[PDB]
Design an enzyme around this catalytic site. Structure first.
Site, short mmCIF file in Angstrom:
data_model
loop_
_atom_site.label_atom_id
_atom_site.label_comp_id
_atom_site.label_asym_id
_atom_site.label_seq_id
_atom_site.Cartn_x
_atom_site.Cartn_y
_atom_site.Cartn_z
NE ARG A 169 -3.88 2.34 1.76
CZ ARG A 169 -5.02 2.44 2.41
NH1 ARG A 169 -5.44 1.42 3.10
NH2 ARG A 169 -5.75 3.52 2.30
CG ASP A 220 -11.45 0.72 6.63
OD1 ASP A 220 -10.30 1.16 6.59
OD2 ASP A 220 -12.35 1.07 5.85
NE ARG A 233 -8.28 2.13 -1.38
CZ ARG A 233 -8.77 2.85 -0.38
NH1 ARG A 233 -9.16 2.26 0.73
NH2 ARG A 233 -8.87 4.19 -0.49
CG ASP A 273 -9.04 0.34 3.34
OD1 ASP A 273 -8.25 0.97 4.05
OD2 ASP A 273 -10.31 0.53 3.33
N1 LIG Z 1 -11.56 2.28 12.44
C1 LIG Z 1 -10.38 2.53 11.80
N2 LIG Z 1 -9.79 1.54 11.08
C2 LIG Z 1 -8.64 1.82 10.48
N3 LIG Z 1 -7.96 2.97 10.42
C3 LIG Z 1 -8.59 3.93 11.14
C4 LIG Z 1 -9.73 3.78 11.86
N4 LIG Z 1 -10.09 4.94 12.50
C5 LIG Z 1 -9.15 5.78 12.16
N5 LIG Z 1 -8.22 5.23 11.32
C6 LIG Z 1 -7.14 6.03 10.76
O1 LIG Z 1 -7.48 6.24 9.38
C7 LIG Z 1 -6.26 6.68 8.78
C8 LIG Z 1 -6.47 6.90 7.28
O2 LIG Z 1 -6.80 5.65 6.74
P1 LIG Z 1 -7.24 5.51 5.16
O3 LIG Z 1 -7.18 4.07 4.92
O4 LIG Z 1 -6.40 6.39 4.33
C9 LIG Z 1 -8.96 6.04 5.06
P2 LIG Z 1 -9.95 5.05 3.92
O5 LIG Z 1 -10.10 3.66 4.47
O6 LIG Z 1 -9.42 5.16 2.53
O7 LIG Z 1 -11.38 5.73 3.93
P3 LIG Z 1 -12.65 5.49 4.90
O8 LIG Z 1 -12.16 5.65 6.31
O9 LIG Z 1 -13.63 6.57 4.46
O10 LIG Z 1 -13.13 4.09 4.66
C10 LIG Z 1 -5.27 5.67 9.28
O11 LIG Z 1 -3.93 6.08 9.10
C11 LIG Z 1 -5.75 5.41 10.72
O12 LIG Z 1 -4.91 6.07 11.67
N1 LIG Z 2 -17.01 -0.43 -3.28
C1 LIG Z 2 -16.11 0.25 -2.56
N2 LIG Z 2 -15.96 1.55 -2.76
C2 LIG Z 2 -15.02 2.11 -1.95
N3 LIG Z 2 -14.68 3.41 -1.91
C3 LIG Z 2 -13.78 3.57 -0.92
S1 LIG Z 2 -13.08 5.07 -0.45
C4 LIG Z 2 -14.42 5.45 0.93
C5 LIG Z 2 -15.78 6.12 0.48
C6 LIG Z 2 -15.92 7.43 0.02
C7 LIG Z 2 -17.10 7.96 -0.44
C8 LIG Z 2 -18.24 7.19 -0.45
C9 LIG Z 2 -18.15 5.90 0.01
C10 LIG Z 2 -16.94 5.39 0.46
F1 LIG Z 2 -16.93 4.13 0.87
N4 LIG Z 2 -13.49 2.38 -0.35
C11 LIG Z 2 -14.29 1.46 -0.98
C12 LIG Z 2 -14.46 0.13 -0.82
O1 LIG Z 2 -13.85 -0.66 0.02
N5 LIG Z 2 -15.41 -0.45 -1.64
CA LIG Z 3 -11.90 2.21 3.92
CA LIG Z 4 -8.60 2.44 5.78
CL LIG Z 5 -1.73 0.93 -3.01
#
Ligand SMILES: Nc1ncnc2c1ncn2[C@@H]1O[C@H](COP(=O)(O)CP(=O)(O)OP(=O)(O)O)[C@@H](O)[C@H]1O
Ligand SMILES: Nc1nc2[nH]c(SCc3ccccc3F)nc2c(=O)[nH]1
Ligand SMILES: [Ca+2]
Ligand SMILES: [Ca+2]
Ligand SMILES: [Cl-]
Ligand SMILES: [Ca+2]
Ligand SMILES: [Ca+2]
Ligand SMILES: [Cl-]
Ligand code: NA
Length: 159
Positions: free
Chosen positions: A83, A98, A93, A96
């Site tokens: 990543r 979460d 990516r 991911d």
């Molecule tokens: N529940 C959680 N799970 C994972 N990371 C988390 C988290 N809550 C906060 N974070 C923080 O989120 C930061 C940014 O993570 P990213 O992966 O860039 C966001 P994303 O998953 O792309 O979007 P999203 O959060 O809208 O799904 C991490 O560096 C981490 O510190």
């Molecule tokens: N289908 C799918 N779409 C994604 N878009 C993102 S960026 C967060 C995000 C941003 C905006 C709206 C919804 C969102 F979820 N992550 C994923 C994923 O895991 N699956």
């Molecule tokens: Ca995410």
């Molecule tokens: Ca994330």
């Molecule tokens: Cl990546």
């Protein structure tokens, strides 16, 4: 121990390969055991749409780690699977991970917000979660089954 629920997404560099590799790495997290793995779903991208479709899944992970210690491991796994952070918000990516839920805990630290702030609005999180934990109740008492019964989410298709 507590049961944490982790959402998995990948849309780069062979998502099936990335997610299978991630499952192996999640197994190797210390003080932790995978209890359940969802099906894999092929989902259209939400937010920016100029990217490949995602593979989304969820895992139930029993753990005695502290919540931030679990985050340490999930971030390590993402980085070890290549990543790379780019400047575009919500870009594609390789992996991911979460943390959706950490038992019934409400966590708000500098690095970690649990429940995941938007999960109740995302079918690609909720449907795999319901597959592995149909009886789930959120920290605020809301039932997963009731959200999925009441709210319109588009149908998900398996990978
Ligand atoms: N529940 C959680 N799970 C994972 N990371 C988390 C988290 N809550 C906060 N974070 C923080 O989120 C930061 C940014 O993570 P990213 O992966 O860039 C966001 P994303 O998953 O792309 O979007 P999203 O959060 O809208 O799904 C991490 O560096 C981490 O510190
Ligand atoms: N289908 C799918 N779409 C994604 N878009 C993102 S960026 C967060 C995000 C941003 C905006 C709206 C919804 C969102 F979820 N992550 C994923 C994923 O895991 N699956
Ligand atoms: Ca995410
Ligand atoms: Ca994330
Ligand atoms: Cl990546
Ligand atoms: Ca383990
Ligand atoms: Ca873009
Ligand atoms: Cl909640
Ligand atoms: Na509520």
């Amino acid at each position: 121990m507590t049961v944490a629920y982790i959402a998995i997404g990948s849309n780069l560099a062979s998502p099936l390969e990335q997610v299978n590799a991630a499952l192996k790495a999640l197994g190797d997290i210390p003080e932790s055991h995978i209890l359940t793995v969802s099906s894999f779903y092929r989902t259209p991208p939400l937010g920016p749409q100029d990217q490949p479709d995602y593979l989304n899944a969820a895992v139930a992970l029993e753990t005695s780690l502290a919540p931030e210690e679990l985050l340490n491991h999930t971030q390590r796994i993402e980085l070890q699977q290549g990543r790379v952070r780019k400047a575009e918000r919500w870009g594609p990516r390789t992996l991911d991970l979460d943390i959706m839920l950490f038992g019934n805990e409400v966590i708000n630290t500098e690095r970690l917000t649990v429940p995941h702030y938007d999960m109740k609005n995302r079918g690609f999180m909720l449907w795999p979660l319901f597959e592995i934990a149909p009886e789930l109740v959120f920290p605020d008492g809301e039932m997963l089954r009731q959200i999925l019964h009441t709210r319109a989410f588009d149908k998900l298709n398996k990978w």
